[PDB]
Design a protein around this ligand. Structure first.
Ligand SMILES: [Cl-]
Ligand SMILES: [Cl-]
Ligand SMILES: [Cl-]
Ligand SMILES: [Cl-]
Ligand SMILES: [Cl-]
Ligand SMILES: [Cl-]
Ligand SMILES: [Cl-]
Ligand SMILES: [Cl-]
Ligand SMILES: [Cl-]
Ligand code: NA
Ligand code: NA
Lengths: 135, 156, 156, 135
C-alpha cells in the first residue's frame, strides 16, 4: 500500500491511497485502501489521512475518519488523535500498521505501530525528511 | 500557512538487521524523489488533489512499493488493485477496487470522482467505465515482479 | 430489560399521491411480520447478530423490498447485490458487494465475517468463497420480478 | 435497500444492511450499503446503525459511523446525533434518505429526510410500531 496527503497554498486538503493488497489474499478481498473513512479520508475542517497495514482492522475501526472525528468532535490535536488510533485502538483490535496525516493548519504526523513504515514529508520550499524505521 | 506533503510506501516488518545501508538508500532515494516532486508542485501553486494524485501515481509506478507496478499477488497468482482519492474541499471522493487491467488505479479513482456521480466502482464495471473514457487497457502481468512472486511462493 | 429491534425497507421511493391504501396495507403487514419475528427472537434470548441476520434475510426474501428477491435491475438487465453485517460485541464485520449468484447476500456477508480472515469480498471471488463454504449457487434470474423490470423499462 | 438493528438481552448491539442497488445502475457501482461505517455499523459502546438513501453522500459523510462518533466524542444523545446527520449534514451535501439506530442504552431512532421510509420497531415484550410516511 502507498499513499499521499497534502495541504496546498489555498488551504485545501486531499488524500490518496493505492495498493495491491496483502500477499496470498483470497481473490475478491477488499481492504481499507479504497474505502472512504477507512484507508483514505480528507476534510478541510480537520485532516487528510492515508493508511497502511492490516486492512481489516482499519475498516472495522474506521481509522482515517476516526482521526478526523477525534479532532473535530473530541478537540484532540493531530498528535493526540494519531496516538490514540494507531498506538492504542488499532493494537487493541489486533491491527498492525500506520498512517500519514496533515491537519488544516499544516501539522503533520506519521504514526505507525510496526517495525517500519516507508515514509517522507516536507514543507513547500524546504528540504524533506525521509524515514523507514522507528524514530 | 505553509503548504506541505507527506507520503508513505507501506508499514510492516522492515528489518534493519537483514538490510544494508545501500539497500535502505534505494528506498530513501525513491521516497525523496517523489516527495520532492510533490513539494515543487505545491510551491508552484498546484492543488492538493493534483499533488496527492501524482505522488500516488509515482508510488504506483515504482516497483519497490506494493501498488501498481510491484503489487503483491493473490492466492491465485493474480493481481487485484484498489485505490481511493478524496478532495477535502468538496468532500468528493473516487475509488476503485478489484481492478486488474488499469495501470494506475489512483488515476482510475480520480476519474470516478470527476467524470461520474459515483464514489466507488469495482471490477469489470470500473474497468469498462474507465476504458469508455480513454483510459488504456493493460494486461496484469505488467505489475508482476520476481520479488513479490518469491514472497507468494514463500508464503505458501 | 432494554432489548429492542428496528427494521427498514428503504427510504425515498415512497409517494403518497402515487400509492393506494391496499398497497400501503401490504407494506405494513410485511413490516409487521418481520419485526414480530425479530421481537420474538429477542424475547427468547437469541443474539442481536442472529436477529438482524434473520430480519434482513426475511426482507431479502420479501419481493416488496429492493434486496434479494425483488432487487432492482442494473443498466444491463442484471442484478448486482450488496450487504453488510456488523457485530457490536467483537467489532467484527462481513460484507459482500456485486454478487449475483447468492440468494441471500446478508448470509454471504455473515459467512465472510465468520469463515474468512476478511471483512469485505466482492464479485466472483466473493461467490467462489461462498460456494467453497457450501453456500448454494442460484441462477441470477431468481431475483427478477416484473414490477422491477417494468421500472427498468420506464427508467430507460 | 433494507436493514435491521437490534439490542439483545445480553446487551449486545448488531446491524445489517442489504440492497439491490438502483434501477438502471451503472454496473460495478457500489453505494453505502456494504461499506462499514457508511451504510452499516455496530459497536456495543455506542450504537448500531443501518442506512438507506443516496449512497454517495452516505459514503462521503460516513453516516453510520458519524452517528457513533458524535455520541462517543461529541457527547450528543442518539436523537441529537440523528438530527445532526440526517436533517443537517446529509442534505447539506445533497443527500436524501434516512437510517435506523439503537444505542447501548436502548434508545431507538428512525430518522429520515424523505417523504417516506418503510420502517418498524418494537421493544421486547411490547407491541411493535410500523410506519411509511412522516409524523
Ligand atoms: Cl511489524
Ligand atoms: Cl555504504
Ligand atoms: Cl496504460
Ligand atoms: Cl522482476
Ligand atoms: Cl381500500
Ligand atoms: Cl435457492
Ligand atoms: Cl414477478
Ligand atoms: Cl458535525
Ligand atoms: Cl422523498
Ligand atoms: Na509500485
Ligand atoms: Na426482497
Amino acid at each position: 500500500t502507498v499513499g499521499a496527503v497534502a495541504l496546498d497554498l489555498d488551504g485545501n486538503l486531499a488524500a490518496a491511497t493505492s495498493t495491491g493488497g496483502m500477499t496470498n489474499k483470497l481473490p475478491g478481498r477488499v481492504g481499507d485502501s479504497p474505502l472512504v473513512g477507512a484507508g483514505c479520508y480528507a476534510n478541510n475542517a480537520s485532516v487528510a489521512v492515508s493508511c497502511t497495514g492490516t486492512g481489516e482492522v482499519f475498516i472495522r475501526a474506521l481509522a482515517a475518519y476516526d482521526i478526523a472525528a477525534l479532532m473535530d468532535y473530541g478537540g484532540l490535536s493531530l498528535a493526540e488523535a494519531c496516538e490514540r488510533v494507531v498506538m492504542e485502538k488499532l493494537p487493541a483490535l489486533g491491527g498492525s500498521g500506520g498512517l500519514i496525516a496533515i491537519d488544516h493548519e499544516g501539522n503533520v504526523a506519521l504514526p505507525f505501530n510496526t517495525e517500519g513504515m516507508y515514509r517522507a514529508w516536507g514543507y513547500a520550499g524546504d528540504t524533506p525528511t525521509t524515514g523507514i524505521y522507528r524514530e | 500557512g505553509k503548504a506541505v506533503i507527506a507520503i508513505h510506501g507501506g508499514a510492516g516488518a522492515i528489518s534493519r538487521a537483514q538490510m544494508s545501508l545501500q539497500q535502505e538508500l534505494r528506498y530513501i532515494e525513491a521516497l525523496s524523489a517523489i516527495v520532492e516532486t510533490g513539494q515543487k508542485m505545491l510551491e508552484a501553486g498546484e492543488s492538493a488533489l493534483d499533488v496527492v494524485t501524482e505522488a500516488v501515481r509515482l508510488l504506483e509506478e515504482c516497483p519497490l512499493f506494493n501498488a501498481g507496478i510491484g503489487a503483491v499477488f493473490t492466492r491465485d497468482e493474480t493481481h487485484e488493485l484498489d485505490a481511493c482519492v478524496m478532495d477535502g474541499n468538496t468532500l468528493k471522493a473516487g475509488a476503485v477496487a478489484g481492478v486488474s487491467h488499469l495501470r494506475n488505479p489512483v488515476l482510475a479513482a480520480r476519474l470516478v470522482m470527476e467524470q461520474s456521480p459515483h464514489v466507488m466502482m469495482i471490477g469489470e464495471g470500473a474497468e469498462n467505465f474507465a476504458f469508455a473514457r480513454g483510459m488504456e487497457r493493460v494486461s496484469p502481468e505488467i505489475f508482476s515482479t520476481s520479488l513479490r512472486y518469491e514472497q507468494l511462493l514463500a508464503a505458501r
